[PDB]
Design an enzyme around this catalytic site. Structure first.
Site, PDB file in Angstrom:
ATOM      1  N   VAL A 156      -1.217  -1.823  -4.656  1.00 31.05           N
ATOM      2  CA  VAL A 156       0.022  -2.331  -5.218  1.00 31.05           C
ATOM      3  C   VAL A 156      -0.029  -3.883  -5.299  1.00 31.05           C
ATOM      4  CG1 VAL A 156       2.969  -2.300  -6.287  1.00 31.05           C
ATOM      5  CG2 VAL A 156       1.536   0.247  -5.092  1.00 31.05           C
TER       6      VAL A 156
ATOM      7  N   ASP B 210       9.735  13.501  -1.226  1.00 26.08           N
ATOM      8  CA  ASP B 210       9.518  11.451  -0.766  1.00 26.08           C
ATOM      9  C   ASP B 210      10.507  10.642  -0.443  1.00 26.08           C
ATOM     10  OD1 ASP B 210       8.490  10.572   2.862  1.00 26.08           O
ATOM     11  OD2 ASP B 210       6.796   9.929   1.040  1.00 26.08           O
TER      12      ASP B 210
ATOM     13  N   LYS C 149       0.587  -1.331   0.158  1.00 26.07           N
ATOM     14  CA  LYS C 149      -0.484   0.226   0.190  1.00 26.07           C
ATOM     15  C   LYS C 149       1.233   1.314  -0.263  1.00 26.07           C
TER      16      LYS C 149
END
EC number: 2.7.11.30
Length: 304
Positions: free
Chosen positions: A20, A134, A14
């Site tokens: 996914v 990120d 996730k």
């Protein structure tokens, strides 16, 4: 259009947004990130970043296609990419130690992907600069050949160098607190300057290089796997906890004295220090890190 030709096998994870799955497209293993109509904005943003002309690069997750079924279900929006059986770098470094060659391959590949992401190409088949926002070992995948590729563009920003327009969503502090640069932690970052985003990605990449180097085994000697700041902040650190260590105390992950004994570890340690300055404008660029590691690999006979 591809969704009707894919058989979903199993869910594997996730992301910040979406789930996914490992899937099969006419017999070939693929990864499918699935979103419902509720996360249409995150699906749309990631699909847009992936469809950038000249973004294809061996160290950026390989995009295949985006699809919209208009069915009103949990499998409505698709983002299909390459599948990498090893999974992410965090899991890889927890399981394995790496040789000097293996460390250079993981570091150079990460830097090459980030340099491509950051690079502005001028022309007709040109490319705008993109910042990730990120970067961390959980957002890097390890390929079968032992090199990396960067994934998860849900928070990425695109620059327009001509009109200074930054395509940003959201226009505030985001990312994993552990990897946030000092200027992000203390709110001094200039959000209207695209360079700020590139500098913050570099700081995070320096932390990832420290995670890799700890796992570099020379004659069986290496460190146990740890996240950066494992020794200084609690699990799931708050912005205040991170600010105290990174901004107030000016601390960075400790560089073992023994890394000075090996040329590759010395080069890695110098790159980390030059990613970690509080002054973001003094940090190295991704292109310069890539070329330092490329020169080292070339001279040492390491081929990618």
């Amino acid at each position: 259009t591809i969704a009707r030709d894919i058989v979903l096998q199993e869910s594997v994870g996730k992301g910040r947004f979406g789930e996914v799955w490992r899937g099969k497209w006419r017999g070939e293993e693929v990864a499918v990130k699935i979103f419902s109509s509720r996360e249409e904005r995150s699906w749309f943003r990631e699909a847009e970043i992936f469809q950038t002309v000249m973004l294809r690069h061996e160290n950026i997750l390989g995009f295949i296609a985006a699809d919209n079924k208009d069915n009103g279900t949990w499998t409505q929006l698709w983002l299909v990419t390459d599948f990498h059986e090893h999974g992410n770098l965090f899991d890889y470094l927890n399981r394995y130690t790496v040789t000097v060659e293996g460390m250079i391959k993981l570091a150079l590949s990460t830097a090459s992907g980030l340099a491509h992401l950051h690079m502005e190409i001028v022309g007709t088949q040109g490319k705008p600069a993109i910042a990730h926002r990120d970067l961390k070992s959980k957002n890097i995948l390890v390929k079968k050949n032992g090199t990396c590729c960067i994934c998860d563009f849900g928070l990425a920003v695109r620059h327009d160098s001509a009109t200074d327009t930054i395509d940003i969503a959201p226009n505030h502090r985001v990312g994993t607190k552990r990897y946030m640069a000092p200027e992000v932690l203390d709110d001094s970052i200039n959000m209207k300057h695209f360079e700020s985003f590139k500098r913050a990605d570099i700081y995070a990449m320096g932390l990832v290089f420290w995670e890799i180097a700890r796992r570099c085994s020379i004659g069986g000697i290496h460190e146990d796997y740890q996240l950066p700041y494992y020794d200084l902040v609690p699990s799931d650190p708050s912005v205040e906890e991170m600010r105290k260590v990174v901004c107030e105390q000016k601390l960075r992950p400790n560089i073992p004295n023994r890394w000075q004994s090996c040329e590759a570890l010395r080069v890695m340690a110098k790159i980390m220090r030059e990613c970690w300055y509080a002054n973001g404008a003094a940090r190295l660029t991704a292109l310069r890190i890539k070329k330092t590691l490329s020169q080292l690999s070339q001279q040492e006979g390491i081929k990618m």
